[PDB]
Design a protein around this ligand. Structure first.
Ligand SMILES: OC[C@H]1O[C@H](O)[C@H](O)[C@@H](O)[C@@H]1O
Ligand SMILES: OC[C@H]1O[C@H](O)[C@H](O)[C@@H](O)[C@@H]1O
Ligand SMILES: OC[C@H]1O[C@H](O)[C@H](O)[C@@H](O)[C@@H]1O
Ligand SMILES: OC[C@H]1O[C@H](O)[C@H](O)[C@@H](O)[C@@H]1O
Ligand SMILES: [Mg+2]
Ligand SMILES: [Mg+2]
Ligand SMILES: [Mg+2]
Ligand SMILES: [Mg+2]
Ligand SMILES: [Mn+2]
Ligand SMILES: [Mn+2]
Ligand SMILES: [Mn+2]
Ligand SMILES: [Mn+2]
Lengths: 387, 387, 387, 387
């Protein structure tokens, strides 16, 4: 009890998350498939704001136009019945065997064209359902061997695909934006644009860079041992955090997709502190898998746990930042000096400033403790409710 | 014998590499310090093209102007005696205790100003010695705890420092360029700009982005489990491979700095294949540590091994690419199709192309094997000399 | 050409390896299922010595006695037709949803009993087919959360299961032995007995420890960042290398199961050097997955590559050890002294030996270089055929 | 405030922890050396129970007998002044250059003998100071290359060294026991006995195995991506947890030695839950490094944080286990069934039990959810104080 989510909290879930049947590389499904209608209803009951989908989550692959219409009709009626939104959608360019060597960067040109047409079709549908963000996860773009993919060529093809997608949404007058979801590996041995940084750098070479941002996932950066709050900070600094995927992950191993808050709890705390202090206004989207040990009821407890954990961490981070003792510790550690310009007086003033070099007392500066440990223990006490 | 390096091969070494005394976090030095003069002479004898330096490698910290002049004079005479060049230099912003919380992103503003003045001083010296590249390795820019560094503020300070450095070299009319050397961690718990991608993305927000590239290191990207040849390919694609650091590393652990070729041998092969096929013309710089088990003679055998291993891999990669059977396998795997534009016919033609979607035979495409394993075994046979 | 395997080389393959249809967590199958008969025939044609199986690879789960008999009959006729052997078999205690919380350590007692009965049934079949080793891979024994499994209780249950299995084979007079296959994670978040060491230690608490050894897999120890040749050496030292699984893996990430020789090539070289120099006489078993990009022909090229790579590395390691220059380098590095007893003169002689402490010249010893780098470059030259 | 440690809590610290001057591989010291006397006094003031030492922490290397006596005399007076104990001691076989290739497993035989004599000398001193445990950390036992160390030979030498040490303490009638501290890597590329499992397995081949246990360190098992509470559980199961090193670590990277509670907070919670529920009665020893950003006051805040975090986690784990709602959830997840014997009725009864196989309803069992997520969210709510 307490920490009750409401749609105002902007919590969203992929249809593929609570709908995961439990198939893993070594195991058959442990749960029956879910009707997306029932997922929308169960999530709304938990306080979710909305759901997201792959084209093939909502409309089974190979569906006829008649079936397509009826699937969308039922989905639309579930959103109307609940008030749930659809802020984001994405294309499945990874499940069908045809994408075994990739979608946009498949060596076979005809597969690349098919991947683009499959995406364009779903962009139209996502706009009709109100999505503001279209996510691209190039899970099959990569290689297990060095000769199989010329990466420069593949980046050329990747740029062509995203440029074409940008040309398309511009030509329809759509307001939707694109977000690249990086992942370093799995299912490919190495995946192109493996981290937030690589995706941010890639975007700066696109024809219309303002149309594209990142959709970073907690577990994906942690799969490379990276600091996810640091990556988010650089995404925010670049103005490119269009969307975020929240979940949990225990270090460098297979993609776990634990519920948010599990995995690296302290990193979750610093992430929530950053998102709230930066004023991130996008969806708080959970891309997690209820473990296959769970039954139907365990699925919903897992989804509820994601939201609850976000709300607990939100309260603790806010109490941390509002605490006068923390505010004094932050001054003691010179976080206020970190926010001041190094040299607003300009280069020439810096060059003539004898206190910056010729008369800098390097030993007195070096002897100044940063007091980071007392600050960090204050953060821990706040996280744990032990103040 | 065979595989004999010559200065034409552009092999360079940091003074700090063969000069490493063997101090590690758990151990005292195992070798005496080297005079940079003797290192220049011993490396030239091995076939090196040149050496690189930290300011504090060449001139001991705190040196007087008179001592500074004599240190440079002796170094200059060693280069003249040997023909060795100095293509690159860098600032030590990590050893002195004053940098314990960083150089350019230290929370203390006066340390940030000192770090800039220390760098500017060394840029002048590096230009005098002929360096074309100035490397920045922010090894102390980062944190061990989440409250200690606001990363957005720190990126603001990092951008200010690099912009100021760019303003300086512009104001002197220097031709030297900057290269960011990323590293994900160590000595800080997490280091800012942790990978090639993060550095590439950062550079695109600098005031004069054309002045800045990356100096990626084999072991640093492998410390995050990333594919180093992939990262190099994205750097080349962006036109930003200004410099490279070659060494070896066994996966995700402390920074090993093994001689090049040790560590991930196959990744070294694919790296050399990429550098040569892309026509990389910069220095082949080794940033390695002769293990502290080695004596003075073991240092030079280790340095010789770096160059020899590059030359062996260069021969094998070239034989791989020139092999008609490999060239046929590459066509079989459709690497030629990967290099063709996905949709040179334009968006509207793609949208009307029924063979791209409505009449695409997705099952026939999916059943087409990529033949990647036969290609990879050809690469292995070439690497091993087992054709 | 060259490096042609023959059954004398003892190369074996799981039915599940070349038979893998390509289903991964993000993808549908890319190849049709194989009849085990055709796999036996295709592998024999490649020079394999034999095949191994899970109960459910050879007899589909839930088969009737009549179907069971006919499946075995056809399999037996394929072995007779080819000369192939079945040196090892194992139980599938991981695919069926009933094992979602484990087999022998499932929290539900009735599942643990079922797992034992399922294994006992297959031990009888494996003995009939001539298997000398029965492998246990507890892929589902573990947890994603800390409260879900009391590990001490689970080790009690694991010991009970293995003791019962040992009591069973003793009671039938079977000569078959058990081998634990460790894996640190995946499909569980953490797996019990995660490494060779943990399995070796566990075995020493079993009732009849001599009946049990390890079946270490290259990729599984590398998934924990461990040195696989080191782990094999400790298994050999303990006398417990009953079986081995050969494949490739690129560091710490999901279980890749690349063909042997791919992944960490140098670790493969040192492994083959150790297995041959120790005189390992068991099967050279490949537990690999032909990547799902491959078609049927790519499967067999991948299997052929496993064997070829073993044979190349075998030749190079042997040339390394037989080289008089290497033999001299090994003396220079004091590998001969490593093999001599530290104190065959006994404790009291060591205590009175003033040359061991009071008069030990610690600086002269410390100044002695180990010459490890020249030795390692000799190993690299031999591996690469660059002598 | 609250969570105040007392010596009854058995909190101990190495002299090398709070005494760490801040030298890392890239940096000079940031703090002056501490007199062990002042460390004993400052730790006692914080509520510590005792301190531990390397021979060379307490007596500078190469000290004369007169200096040795005076160093011990002053240390003894600090313990008498404070009431602090010395429960454990260890030998520095890693700092001096003579150990660059190892101590007990150095290739040079004379170094191995010296290492044994250096240890034996310190065992006498540790017994005089009251130590119950003597720790061996073979940080230099290992290799950076495959030819440099024959691991079977090295394990022979390691067994000889530990057997000799066991013969020595037996011959003096000492009650002290040995504890192996595993570490997977750093400072060597790979370290022998890399994990708790490998050390446990090694001990079972020693002549007097009952004399030897493990001293596992949180960060060392996490450096291999392993679950530390799982490793502790297997150590407890084997009856070998003689000592423990508590600290924090962020995943797979260099050895961080963060204060306990930092790093993987949830793993710390499950560790404390296990230690308390198993009734571990040994020292709660912190092997951590106050980050080199800290001054003298930051050192003591860091040490205080270790103890405080243990006490908070102890309270929360106890509240978790005592909660009737948690106790009901544990029954719902069948943790009570995990603790029951699988087959106390014996093998033959299991073989005839048709409910264990022929009539086992495998689908009804598989459909039973484990309810692990609701249990884990209860654990999270308890950890966070959000019940
Ligand atoms: O395409 C978007 C989604 O695709 C798959 O579900 C991936 O597992 C997930 O990481 C991503 O958010
Ligand atoms: O500053 C440049 C150099 O600094 C240090 O030597 C780092 O260890 C190295 O990675 C880098 O190349
Ligand atoms: O049960 C034995 C086998 O089971 C599965 O195939 C595992 O993937 C493999 O690692 C193991 O060898
Ligand atoms: O020798 C025992 C101690 O040695 C060193 O201090 C190691 O860093 C530490 O892990 C260990 O506890
Ligand atoms: Mg995602
Ligand atoms: Mg470098
Ligand atoms: Mg296996
Ligand atoms: Mg320790
Ligand atoms: Mn994921
Ligand atoms: Mn490095
Ligand atoms: Mn595997
Ligand atoms: Mn440590």
């Amino acid at each position: 009890m307490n920490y009750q989510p409401t749609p105002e909290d902007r919590f969203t879930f992929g249809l593929w998350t609570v709908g995961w049947q439990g198939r893993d590389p070594f195991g058959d499904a442990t749960r029956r498939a879910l009707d997306p209608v029932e997922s929308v209803r169960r999530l709304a009951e938990l306080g979710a704001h909305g759901v997201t989908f792959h084209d093939d989550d909502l409309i089974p692959f190979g569906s006829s136009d008649s079936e397509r219409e009826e699937h969308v009709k039922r989905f639309r009626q579930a959103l109307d019945d609940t008030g749930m939104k659809v802020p984001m959608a994405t294309t499945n360019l990874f499940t069908h065997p045809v994408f075994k060597d990739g979608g946009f960067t498949a060596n076979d040109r005809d597969v690349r064209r098919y991947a683009l047409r499959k995406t364009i079709r779903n962009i139209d549908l996502a706009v009709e359902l109100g999505a503001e963000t279209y996510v691209a996860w190039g899970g099959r773009e990569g290689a297990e061997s060095g000769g199989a993919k010329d990466v420069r060529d593949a980046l050329d093809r990747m740029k062509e695909a995203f440029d074409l997608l940008g040309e398309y949404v511009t030509s329809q007058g759509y307001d939707i934006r694109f977000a690249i979801e990086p992942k370093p590996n799995e299912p490919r041995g190495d995946i192109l644009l493996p981290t937030v940084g690589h995706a941010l750098a890639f975007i700066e070479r696109l024809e219309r860079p303002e149309l594209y941002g990142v959709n970073p996932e907690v577990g994906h950066e942690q799969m490379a041992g990276l600091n996810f709050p640091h990556g988010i900070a650089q995404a925010l600094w670049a103005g490119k955090l269009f969307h975020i995927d929240l979940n949990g992950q225990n270090g460098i191993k297979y993609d776990q997709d634990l519920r948010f808050g599990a995995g690296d709890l302290r990193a979750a705390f610093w992430l929530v502190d950053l998102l709230e202090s930066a004023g991130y206004s996008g969806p708080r989207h959970f891309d997690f898998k209820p473990p296959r040990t769970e039954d139907f009821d365990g699925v919903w407890a897992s989804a509820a746990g994601c939201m609850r954990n976000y709300l607990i961490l939100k309260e603790r981070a806010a109490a941390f930042r509002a605490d006068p003792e923390v505010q004094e510790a932050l001054r003691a550690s010179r976080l206020d000096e970190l926010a001041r310009p190094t040299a607003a007086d300009g280069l020439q003033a810096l060059l003539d400033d004898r206190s910056a070099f010729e008369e800098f007392d390097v030993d007195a500066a070096a002897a100044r403790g940063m007091a980071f440990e007392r600050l960090d223990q204050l953060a821990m006490d706040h996280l744990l409710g032990a103040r």
